Structure formats: structure tokens, C-alpha cells
């Protein structure tokens, strides 16, 4: 047993094994030991899966890179594309032009949009909403539920209710029960009544046909998703308004207006379909007391900042970041990727080798060189363990921190820093701001006088801070990524219209034209938090690429100092209906998103 | 009573799954509530741990011959197997259990079929694609990083229709899918015939569509269905959307030069 960050970890207890985690993306294992009364007192994060991206980059062209890290996730699918393209140019002091920087913003709101949204209902609403209780549900009193959450989602008659219900119903009575096979059902941990079941897995079956719609955005501008195309220097997708023919272009003005559709069916989504049902689901587990799974998230967030509303002006960045300690909201330290002493990581507790492991390496001078070793008080073998030795090597995930501090990033992260910057005077981040407190008002009044529950009071600084509050940051990103990219497909118009068709810069694309040896980085505030790739250029060819990835922060072992990262922090403290069903295990550790394949890369 | 897959994930990006969810006909939704019985897919199910490994056994024993395995991602052999674990073990343990009994074995994606980007030199982990590994049970090969989302159910829209395997090429992959290059059929042709090509990027050229031969285009020598099915229900295909394709769906792709040197001869 030892204390760390405030927490008071402890071995002792009856050991649990949760192997595989499940809907997140990749491969997890987690154990936690639990007290007398199930409560976890020890959490252990083990990444289970490496493929050595940083190595396979050595010698290859920087121009090429984006495709290769571009596959370290098909569900953050283009995140990594745009870090590379943004490292490259970076090192390559390449400026892009004003109508490459919109596409490739909508592209990555895009992403937020979709991604959020998937994950919220495929890969967590299970951990909130039980499927069987669904098939008991009065579909009027669902209807009249649907009406009160979203008065303004169409969808709602009891007929429609009614037929939903009858396919589950029926694809239950088959005894083939697909993915909702040896599921949890039925546990103490689900409190919501039948019809807020019953809406919800709806909405599952809404977003499911919904989803593919939304990423038609990516294929127009990147050709395809998954893996839509990148370029160091702009964007491929040339633009001609006159173009017909043997003269077409990749834009013209029907696909920008087809974009544009798209963009609206998303923003209808979003406000009617995915905050109202975050916002109710959130409410009823507040009134069953379940504020559980802050961990870092009250003391230590960070975030780089993203979306400049000018490009290139870091001081305009509609979600601003920095790093905020001990839970102080009223200082925000500044976060440079570039300082040697500020992101660095630590291999202690992972399964690869420095010189020396007492120190963190900033990712220029980064290192990734395998070491699969099991500390001696593993149970098993090194190809057959039974329970992981986390005092020793326990994860293919390196340990990230910032000067030194665990840190929690993300949606909430991001969220609570823009909340931050707000109070201090920044007009930037005045949406993000009225979303919360909008939120707030919702969860604690509104709708617990339209249920009929009582009305609460708590505080933003004590709503935020819980697997409830993360997973509503991250609708509330979904919500806002959707209303920017709005703005930036007027923008992109307007500039095309004015008569600047540019898209690429190309002047240092051939490198002949390059230093002879240069540095870059290039950051993206990914789905799941705070992304960097390091790049070090010599004679033409990569000679250190490091990534450092949201879920790298998040899901990581122990430091040299033996501080925890945000997913074992997060199961602190948690009681468990039963030990042996993972229920609330999986509802705060998929609040993170976690994806699995980012992490170790 | 609808066909039991099991969807095993190896080392992998997940694409495939992601693409598998983008398809318009069938919806996935219309394929997992009422054409197959996905039973196990770690992207998606309810049950975790110990609930969902129960799951295998269960299925294994009651559809014995008669599942089908799916396989997204791969092997490794370095590190003891242990750069990929499942359940405390190497995941080339369960591949080698699951495929034992499965009636058929389908290879999505680039990952599972040649090896993909972690199998790229020099290939850290020693990934190996599943038809190096399982030697003796019926495997289709379906390439791509991603494949095409149609492309994927149409695969099993075929193997649930017919009870079989479609008409395969000598290298594994369905024919009906596979059959052209991405150069037969692509819209820009006319421009490569008349020797018109995009030479710098957003150049005159690149404006009125011209080929992207000489900008690395891997068209002529990759084997997939972009030129016509296109992606995202027809909506593009990376060439339509201004860059060549990188010849994603072939064996080796990562290591055949830069995606921007043109072919030769
Ligand atoms: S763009 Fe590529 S596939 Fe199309 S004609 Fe040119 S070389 Fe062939
Ligand atoms: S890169 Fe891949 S998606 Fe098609 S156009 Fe080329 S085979
Ligand atoms: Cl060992
Ligand atoms: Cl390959
Ligand atoms: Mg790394």
C-alpha cells in the first residue's frame, strides 16, 4: 500500500481480472483489487498490444509519413494524418493556404462529431442502459418520455416505439443474442426505468444508419473514409467552379453544397438526438448518487488548445488549452510542445528500455525500443498470466507527464479549460462556457421538475469531475465541433467565391529545397484529448518520429515516482455491485474513449 | 436460425470494422439483427472478460463446422507472441482455437490478408497474416485499408446467400470484387491516354482532373473496386478527391517506394 495524488492505493484485496476491456477500440486488460465491501482500492491499466509505428518511420520520406501514422487508428481515422502534415510543415517552415486550413478543420470536426457520437451510443451506452429492461417498456410512456427529453426530435410517436421494440423483442425470443450475449442485464449498477431503455437503444439503432452519412464529408474532401487522404503543403482536393467534364474537379460547388447538407443533419443530431439524451441519462444517474470516476480529472487536465478562429494565431483558439494543478480553475500554465522539460515520458512501469529509466524523455529525443519482461511477483507465465505484476513492467503504454504531473486529457479536460480561460476574460471560449451552465441547469432543475425528481445544486467544479460529467463533456464537443465547422464551410465559400481556389502551398514540396536537417511538431486536439507528433528531418529522410496520443496520457502505467495516470485514478475508490461483473468498471474507463491502438502506436 | 461470426481483432487500426459499419446495402444494422450472429466482436459486445471468452466455447461447441470466423488485424511472433494479448495470452493462441472449427475464414482487410503498416519494414513484432499462421481451413482474402465498405457485406451477403466461398483469384481475393484494376475503369483514363497529368500539386492541371500518374498514382498495378463501386455509397474514391491511390489493397504496399514516385516503364 502506498499514497499518491490523494489517493491511498492497496493491494490487499480480492483481485479482479477484466481481460479483454471490451468495446473500446484495441486491446486492454484491466485488474483492480476490492475491499470488504467491494469497493476498488487499486487499479491496474495494461495496454495489450504494440505495433511500432515510430520504428517502421526511420529513413522514410516526411512526405509519405501521414499515411503511415495515419493507420495507427481507424476510429480517430485522419487525427494522426493532420499531426504529421502539421509536424512536417512545422519542421519544413511551410505556411498552407486559407482554404487547405478550413478543409482540413471541417475535417477534423468531422471526426469529432462522428466519433463522439459512435462511441457515446456503440460503445457506452451499454454500460448505462439495460437492453432486457427495454422489452418492458409501455411504448406511449416512451413516446411521452421522447417528448419531454427532445420535444424537437421527430421520432417519437408510440407507433414508432412500438415497432422498434417488436424487432428487439424478437431478435431476443431467437436465442441468438448477438452482441448482447452473457451481458450484464438485470445488475443493481442499471437504475434507468424501462422507457428511457427503450429510448435509448432507439437512438442506438438511429445513430448506427446515421453515422455513415456523416463521414461522406471525408470522402469528398480525402477520398474515403476510413483513411481519407492527407498532403504536406494543403489538401489534393483542387477546386473549379466552371469544371464539367474532362475538366471536373474535386470541388466544385455541388459537392461543397453537399457538404453543407450534411453539416446541417448533423447539427439537427447532435441538438436532438445526442446532448438531450446524454443530459437525461446523466440526470437520472445523478439522482441514484452515482458522481464516481473523477480521478485526475479534479486535480490535473490538459490540453493543447485547438481551432483557431484566425490560423496560425494560437491566442484565437475556440477551445483553449494549458495545463491546469491541484484543481486550481483560476490559473491556466501555458503548455509548449516544443520545451524539453514540460511533455516528456517515462518507461518504468512499460514494456520498452531507456539508458536510463529514472528519467522522461520529450519526445525529440524519444525512444522506443521493446522490452517484454514480467516482474517477479507475476502469477503465471510470461505467455500465460493470470494476474500482472504492477510494481514491475505492466503495459505497452508509455507513461506521458507534464513536467513531471499526471495529467487527465480529452473532451473534459478541454471542456474544464475552457471554462477556465472563460472566468479569466477569454471571449474565445464563450460557447463552450454557455453549453456548461446550460448543462448544469438542465441536470440539477429542469429535467428533475419535468420527472418529477427533486431539483439539486451542484456546482460545475462538482458536476465536471465524475464519469457522468466526462461523458457529458464530450456530447456538449460533439455539439460545439459541429456548430464550428458550420462556420468554417461559410468561410470556405466566401474565400472561394472572393476568388481564391488555392489549396496547396507547394513551394517546399520537392526536397532539394529543404534544410538539410530540421525539427517539428505538429499537435491536434484528437477525439480523445491531447495529440503530438515529434518529427526530426535529416537529408530528406525521418530520423526520429515519436508520437505521444491522447490514450497514451490517459491509459498509462505508473511513472518513475509512482504516480498514477487518469483511467487507474479514475476506478479509485468505486463500489461494485458484484466483484465479478465489471459493470462499473466499463461505464468509467469507456468515459474515457479509450482507444487502444492510439495508445501504443 | 442466422450464421454464428465470430469477429477475432489481432493487432490492428480497427478500419475495417469501421468501414464493415459504413455500408448502405445491406446496413450493418440490417446484417447483425438479421442476416448473421455476431456472437463475438470486441468493437461491439456487451459482455467483458471472463463472460465474453465464455462466449467462444458456447458457440464453438453448438455451431462446430459451422460458424464462420472473422479475422480483423494480425499475429505477432516476436516478443513471445505477447506484443498482442487476449485473456492473459498471445492472440495467436486463440486464432489457432477459434479457426480449428470454423466452416469458413474471412481475412479483412490489408492487416489480415498480407500484414499491413505494422508489417511494413522492419516489422518490430514479426506480424504475420493469418494464411501464414492457419494452413489448413479455407481462407478469403479481402484487402484494402480499409476495404470498401460494400465490398465487406458483400462478401457476406455472398457466403450467407450461398453457403459458399466466392470464385476466388490465385491470390486469394473474391473475383466479383477484385477482378480489375484500379486503372481499367478510373475516370481520369482518357487524361493518361492523351499524356495529361497533374505535375505539381494544385497546378492548372490538377484543377481540370488531369491523371495523377506522375503525383505516385498506384492505380495501374492495384487490384480493387474504387474506380466504380467508389466510397461512402458512391460518393468518392481517392483519385476523384485529387490523390492517387497509395495501392492499398496489394501485398506490401508500404515498402514498393514513396506513395509519390511515379511507376516506371
Ligand atoms: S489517376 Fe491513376 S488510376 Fe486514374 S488513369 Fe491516372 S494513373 Fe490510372
Ligand atoms: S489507395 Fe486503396 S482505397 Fe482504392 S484507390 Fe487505391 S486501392
Ligand atoms: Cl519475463
Ligand atoms: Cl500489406
Ligand atoms: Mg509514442
Not at chain 1, 482500492?41 to 495494461?46: D, M
Not at chain 1, 529509466?357 to 529525443?365: F, Q, T
Not at chain 1, 525521418?542 to 483511467?567: H, L, M
Request: charged fraction near 20%; proline fraction near 6%.
Amino acid at each position: 500500500a502506498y499514497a499518491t495524488q490523494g489517493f491511498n492505493l492497496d493491494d490487499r484485496g480480492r483481485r479482479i481480472v477484466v481481460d479483454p476491456v471490451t468495446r473500446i477500440e484495441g486491446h486492454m486488460r484491466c485488474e483492480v483489487n476490492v475491499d470488504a465491501n467491494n469497493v476498488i482500492r487499486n487499479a491496474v491499466s495494461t495496454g495489450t498490444m504494440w505495433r511500432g509505428l515510430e520504428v517502421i518511420l526511420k529513413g522514410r520520406d516526411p512526405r509519405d509519413a501521414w499515411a503511415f501514422v495515419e493507420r495507427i487508428c481507424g476510429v480517430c481515422t485522419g487525427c494522426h494524418a493532420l499531426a504529421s502534415v502539421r509536424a512536417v510543415e512545422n519542421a519544413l517552415d511551410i505556411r498552407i493556404p486559407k482554404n487547405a486550413h478550413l478543409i482540413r478543420e471541417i475535417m477534423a470536426k468531422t471526426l469529432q462529431v462522428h466519433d463522439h457520437a459512435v462511441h457515446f451510443y456503440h460503445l457506452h451506452a451499454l454500460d448505462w442502459v439495460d437492453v432486457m429492461s427495454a422489452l418492458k417498456a409501455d411504448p406511449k410512456r416512451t413516446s411521452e418520455l421522447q417528448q419531454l427529453v427532445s420535444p424537437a426530435h421527430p421520432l417519437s410517436s408510440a407507433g414508432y416505439f412500438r415497432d422498434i421494440q417488436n424487432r428487439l423483442k424478437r431478435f431476443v425470443e431467437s436465442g441468438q443474442l448477438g452482441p448482447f450475449m452473457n451481458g450484464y442485464w438485470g445488475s443493481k449498477a442499471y437504475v434507468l426505468p424501462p422507457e428511457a431503455n427503450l429510448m435509448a437503444v432507439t437512438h442506438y439503432l438511429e445513430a448506427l444508419d446515421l453515422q455513415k452519412e456523416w463521414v461522406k464529408i471525408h470522402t469528398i474532401f480525402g477520398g474515403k473514409n476510413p483513411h481519407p487522404n492527407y498532403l504536406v503543403g494543403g489538401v489534393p482536393c483542387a477546386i473549379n467552379l466552371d469544371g464539367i467534364g474532362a475538366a471536373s474537379a474535386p470541388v466544385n460547388m455541388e459537392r461543397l453544397s453537399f457538404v453543407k447538407a450534411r453539416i446541417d443533419e448533423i447539427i439537427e443530431f447532435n441538438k436532438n438526438v445526442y446532448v438531450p439524451d446524454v443530459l437525461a441519462i446523466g440526470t437520472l444517474y445523478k439522482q441514484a448518487g452515482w458522481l464516481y470516476g473523477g480521478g485526475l480529472a479534479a486535480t490535473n487536465v490538459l490540453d493543447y488548445g485547438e481551432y483557431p478562429n484566425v490560423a496560425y494565431n494560437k491566442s484565437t483558439d475556440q477551445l483553449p488549452g494549458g495545463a491546469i494543478l491541484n484543481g486550481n480553475w483560476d490559473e491556466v500554465f501555458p503548455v509548449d510542445p516544443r520545451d524539453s522539460q514540460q511533455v516528456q515520458e517515462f518507461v518504468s512501469h512499460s514494456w520498452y528500455k531507456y539508458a536510463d529509466e529514472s528519467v522522461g524523455l520529450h519526445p525529440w529525443d524519444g525512444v522506443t525500443e521493446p522490452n517484454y519482461v514480467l516482474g517477479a511477483n507475476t502469477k503465471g507465465t510470461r505467455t500465460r498470466i493470470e494476474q500482472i505484476d504492477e510494481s514491475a513492467k505492466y503495459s505497452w503504454i508509455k507513461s506521458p507527464r507534464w513536467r513531471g504531473h499526471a495529467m487527465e486529457v480529452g473532451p473534459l479536460s478541454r471542456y474544464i479549460l475552457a471554462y477556465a480561460h472563460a472566468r479569466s476574460g477569454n471571449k474565445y471560449a464563450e460557447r463552450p462556457k454557455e453549453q456548461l451552465e446550460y448543462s448544469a441547469q438542465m441536470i440539477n432543475s429542469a429535467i428533475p421538475k419535468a420527472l418529477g425528481l427533486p431539483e439539486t445544486q451542484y456546482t460545475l467544479k462538482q458536476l465536471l469531475p465524475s464519469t457522468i460529467g466526462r461523458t457529458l463533456a464530450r456530447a456538449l464537443e460533439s455539439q460545439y465541433c459541429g456548430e464550428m465547422m458550420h462556420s468554417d464551410w461559410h468561410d470556405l465559400v466566401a474565400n472561394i467565391r472572393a476568388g481564391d481556389t488555392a489549396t496547396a502551398n507547394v513551394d517546399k514540396w520537392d526536397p532539394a529545397t529543404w534544410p538539410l536537417q530540421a525539427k517539428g511538431v505538429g499537435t491536434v486536439a484528437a477525439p480523445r484529448g491531447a495529440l503530438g507528433h515529434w518529427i526530426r528531418i535529416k537529408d530528406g529522410r525521418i530520423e526520429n518520429y515519436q508520437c505521444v496520443v491522447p490514450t497514451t496520457w490517459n491509459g498509462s502505467p505508473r511513472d518513475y515516482k509512482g504516480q498514477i495516470g487518469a483511467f487507474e485514478a479514475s476506478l479509485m475508490n468505486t463500489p461494485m455491485v458484484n466483484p465479478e461483473q465489471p459493470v462499473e468498471i466499463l461505464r468509467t474507463l469507456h468515459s474515457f474513449d479509450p482507444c487502444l491502438a492510439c495508445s501504443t502506436h | 436460425p442466422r450464421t454464428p461470426v465470430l469477429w477475432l481483432h489481432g493487432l490492428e487500426c480497427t478500419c475495417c470494422s469501421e468501414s464493415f459499419i459504413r455500408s448502405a446495402h445491406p446496413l450493418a444494422k440490417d446484417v447483425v439483427l438479421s442476416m448473421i450472429s455476431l456472437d463475438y466482436d470486441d468493437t461491439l459486445m456487451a459482455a467483458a472478460g471472463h463472460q465474453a471468452e465464455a462466449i467462444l466455447e458456447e458457440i464453438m461447441t453448438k455451431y462446430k463446422g459451422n460458424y464462420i470466423l472473422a479475422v480483423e488485424g494480425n499475429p505477432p511472433l516476436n516478443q513471445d507472441g505477447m506484443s498482442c494479448i487476449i485473456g492473459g495470452r498471445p492472440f495467436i493462441e486463440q486464432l489457432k482455437y477459434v479457426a480449428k472449427d470454423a466452416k469458413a475464414i474471412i481475412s479483412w482487410g490489408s492487416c489480415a490478408s498480407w500484414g499491413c503498416v505494422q508489417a511494413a519494414k522492419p516489422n518490430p513484432t514479426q506480424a504475420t497474416p493469418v494464411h501464414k499462421v492457419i494452413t489448413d481451413k479455407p481462407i478469403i482474402k479481402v484487402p484494402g485499408c480499409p476495404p470498401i465498405a460494400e465490398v465487406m457485406t458483400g462478401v457476406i451477403t455472398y457466403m450467407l446467400t450461398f453457403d459458399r466461398i466466392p470464385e476466388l483469384d490465385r491470390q486469394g481475393r473474391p473475383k466479383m470484387f477484385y477482378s480489375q484494376r484500379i486503372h481499367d475503369k478510373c475516370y481520369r483514363r482518357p487524361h493518361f491516354d492523351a499524356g495529361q497529368f497533374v505535375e505539381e500539386w494544385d497546378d492548372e492541371s490538377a484543377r481540370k482532373g488531369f491523371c495523377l500518374y506522375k503525383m505516385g498514382c498506384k492505380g495501374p498495378t492495384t487490384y480493387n473496386a474504387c474506380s466504380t463501386t467508389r466510397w461512402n455509397e458512391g460518393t468518392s474514391f481517392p483519385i476523384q478527391s485529387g490523390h492517387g491511390c497509395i495501392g492499398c489493397s496489394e501485398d506490401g504496399f508500404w515498402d514498393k517506394g514513396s506513395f509519390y514516385d511515379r511507376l516506371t516503364g
